Amino acid sequence: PNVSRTIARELKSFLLEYTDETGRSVYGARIRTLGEMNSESLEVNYRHLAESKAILALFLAKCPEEMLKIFDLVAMEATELHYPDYARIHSEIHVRISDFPTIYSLRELRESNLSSLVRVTGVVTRRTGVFPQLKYVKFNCLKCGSILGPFFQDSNEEIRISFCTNCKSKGPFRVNGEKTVYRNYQRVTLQEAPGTVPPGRLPRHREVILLADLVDVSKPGEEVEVTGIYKNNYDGNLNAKNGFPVFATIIEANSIKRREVFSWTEEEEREFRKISRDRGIIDKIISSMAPSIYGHRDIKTAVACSLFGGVPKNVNGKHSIRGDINVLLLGDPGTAKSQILKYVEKTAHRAVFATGQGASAVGLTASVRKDPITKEWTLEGGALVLADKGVCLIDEFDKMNDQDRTSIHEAMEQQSISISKAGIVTTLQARCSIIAAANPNGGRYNSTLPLAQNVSLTEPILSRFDILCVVRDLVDEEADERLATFVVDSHVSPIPQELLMKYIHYARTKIYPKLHQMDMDKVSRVYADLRRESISTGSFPITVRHLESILRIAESFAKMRLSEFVSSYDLDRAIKVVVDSFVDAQKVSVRRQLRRSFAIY
C-alpha cells in the first residue's frame, strides 16, 4: 500500500504536536536527551497513539516489520533539525515500545497471531554472546584491486555479488572486515515461569534474538517482558524434511526490561554521618539486623562485627594484620541456623550462598572447568574467591572431605590460594570474611565437655575463629511463649536494610579510623592478668590470638560508629564479647571464672 504519504505526514504530526496534559510534548524530551546522550534508540508509548487512532495498529498488524520503514527515518528527521551532524555520526536509529495490553503465554501461541504484535512473559536464561554481525558492506576484488559501495542488509539473508562496475564479471569476491561496519546480535534462551505451570503440565521454551545495542541488559534469573513480532526461520537445508513440512518459529523483540547499581548521593551520606555520630547506633543495628527470628542478640552482635570488616595493615609490608572478621556458630538443629546467613546473602554487597555437595552454586574451590558452550576452559573459584573484599557464607561445614577442608584452612591461614594443575600455576587474593555452621554430635551440645572433645572438628582452622558461639535447648516457658507466638503470627525503630547495605557500601570506602596509644597498656595489663587467672582454675589457655581479635573488633566498632578513631569505652564491649565467648566454651569448671573474670566487665 502506497498510503505512506498520508501515514508519514500524520505520524510525524503525532510525533511533533503530541500533547496530553498541560500541552506536554513528551517526546521532545526523549529526542533531546537522545542527542545529548549519543543514543541509538528511542521509546514510544503505544497506548496514546493507539488511543487516538488504532488502524495505525491495523496497518501495523498486517505487516509490522514493514510498519518500521517510516518511523526509523522519521527519527532521523526530528533528530537532525535539533541535532545536525548526528546523522553523520549515528548511521541509524531504532525504536522501542511500551504499554501493550495483550497477553500470551509461551505456549498459547497460535498461527492466527504471528506476523503481528506479540507480547510474552518468561525468564532470560542461558545468555550467549554479544556477537557482531553486519550492517554495511564493502569488498576486496581480485580482477580489479578495488571495492564495493555501501549496502544495507536485510533481516533474513546473506549477500553475494557477481556484477562489477568495471565489467559484468563474477570474479572472486571477499568482504573487507578490515573496513566494514557492524552491529550487535544476541541469541537468547527464554522459558516460562514455573510458579504458574498448572497441574501436571510442563513449561514450554522458546528462543529469542536481541539487537539494537541492547545486549547485556539481562542476567540469569530475571523476569522479563519482551514485546515484539514473530515469524518462522527458512534457514536452508530444508528439502530433507521428513514427516510433514513444518518449520520452527522465532521472535524478533524490540522492548525489554527486567522487573516482571547501589550508590550514594550527597544527602544519602549526609544522613549516614548524621546518624552514625549521634548516640550509639549499635543497639539499633542489632535491633534492625535480621528480624527473621526474634531469637537472640548476642550472635547477631558477633556477626554484626562480622559484617563491616575491620582494617588490615602491614608493618611496612610485613607483619600483616587481618582486618576482616570471622565467625563460627553451632548448636542443635531445632533452632534457626540456616536462615539469617541466607538473609545476609540477600542483604550484603558481593555476598554468596555457596554450600557443600547438593543444592550448591559451586564446590567451594577453583578448578579447570569445561563449559557447555564450545568447550571454553575457565577458572571459576569458590565463593570465597568472589568476595575477596567481602564475605563467604557456608552451612553444614562438617560435611566435607579432605581437600574441600584444606582449602578453607588455606584461606583463613594466608588469605591466598594456590593451584598446581593443568599447565597453570597461580595464587590469588582470598582475604574473605568466613561464616559457617555445622551440626553437633547428638543434636544436643553435651554441656559437660569442652568443644573439640564434643564436636569432632580439628583445631588448626578452629583457632582462626575469634568467635565460636553456641546455644542449645532453651527449655523454659518463656521460650515457648515468645517463639510459638511469633511463628504462629507468621501466618495469622529498626532501619531499612537498603540503608544498612548502603551504609556498609559507604563504610568500606571511606573510614579507616585509627587508635591512639593513650591508655593502651591496660591491654598489656588485663592480658597478663587473665592469662594467669586462666591457669588459676582452668585447663586451656587464652592467647594473643584473642587479643589481636579484640583489636580488630575495636576498629570494627569504630567503623560501626563511623567515629574518627578508637573510643575507650567501647573496648569494654569488644573485650566483654571475647570474655563471654570463652565463658560458654568450656566445662562446668569454668563456673569459677564466672565470678573471677567479671571485674573486667
Q: 410, exposed or middle or buried, with CB in 10 Å at 0-12, 13-18, 19+?
A: middle
- Asked if 568 is part of the footprint of ligand ADP (rule: CB under 6 A), the reply reads no
Q: Which of residues 191-230 bind other proteins (CB under 8 A)?
A: 191, 194-195, 197, 199-205, 207, 220
- Asked if 147 is part of the footprint of Zn ion (rule: CB under 5 A), the reply reads no
Query: Which helix or strand (DSSP H or E) is residue 251 part of?
Result: strand 249-253
- What is the DSSP code string of 120-145? --EEEEEEE---EEEEE--B--SSSS
Stretch that binds Zn ion, among 166-174, 308-316, 473-481, 494-502 (CB under 5 A): 166-174
Widest pairwise Cα distance in the chain? 106
Give, rounded to a whole angstrom, the gap between the first and last alpha carbons of the chain. 89
Interface residue with Zn ion, options 164, 209, 483, 585 (CB under 5 A) = 164
CB of 488 to ligand ADP, least distance (A): 10
Interface residue with other proteins, options 16, 54, 248, 452 (CB under 8 A) = 248
Pairing of β 249-253 and β 227-232: antiparallel
**Binding string to other proteins for residues 145 to 184, with x set by CB under 8 A, is what?**
----xxxxxx----x-x-x---------------------
Q: Which of residues 376-395 bind ligand ADP (CB under 6 A)?
A: 395
Q: Which of residues 476-495 bind ligand ADP (CB under 6 A)?
A: 483, 487
Question: Site size for other proteins, by CB under 8 A?
Answer: 81
From residue 569, give the alpha-carbon distance in Å to each of 250, 303, 309: 67, 21, 20
Cell, residue 284: 539499633
Q: 382, exposed or middle or buried, with CB in 10 Å at 0-12, 13-18, 19+?
A: buried
- Asked if 169 is part of the footprint of Zn ion (rule: CB under 5 A), the reply reads yes
Give the annotated binding-site residues for ATP: 331-338
Cell, residue 460: 588448626
Closest CA to 175 of 187, 197, 188, 159: 159
By C-beta, is 26 or 487 nearer to ligand ADP?
487
Q: Choose the contact partner of 169 out of ligand ADP, other proteins, Zn ion, none; CB within 5 to 8 A by kind.
A: Zn ion
Residue at 165: amino acid letter: T
Give the annotated binding-site residues: 331-338
Interface residue with Zn ion, options 16, 73, 144, 361 (CB under 5 A) = 144
- Asked if 400 is part of the footprint of ligand ADP (rule: CB under 6 A), the reply reads no
- Please tell me the distance from the alpha carbon of residue 98 to that of residue 254, in angstroms, as a whole number: 10
By C-beta, is 258 or 346 nearer to ligand ADP?
346
User: Cα 107 to chain center, whole Å?
Assistant: 30
Question: Site size for Zn ion, by CB under 5 A?
Answer: 6
CB of 315 to other proteins, least distance (A): 47
Q: Choose the contact partner of 57 out of other proteins, ligand ADP, Zn ion, none; CB within 5 to 8 A by kind.
A: none
Q: Which of residues 493-552 bind ligand ADP (CB under 6 A)?
A: none
Three-class secondary structure of residue 367 per DSSP: strand
Provide, for the chain, the percentages of residues in helix, strand and coil under a 3-state DSSP scheme, each rounded to the nearest 5: 35, 15, 50
Residue at 364: amino acid letter: L
- What is the DSSP code string of 466-511? S--EE-----SHHHHHHHHHHHHHTT--PPPHHHHHHHHHHHHHH-
Give residue for cell 574467591.
385
**Binding string to other proteins for residues 282 to 321, with x set by CB under 8 A, is what?**
----------------------------------------
Interface residue with ligand ADP, options 4, 232, 338, 568 (CB under 6 A) = 338
Interface residue with ligand ADP, options 231, 322, 337, 431 (CB under 6 A) = 337
**Binding string to other proteins for residues 70 to 109, with x set by CB under 8 A, is what?**
x--x--x----------x---xx--------------x-x
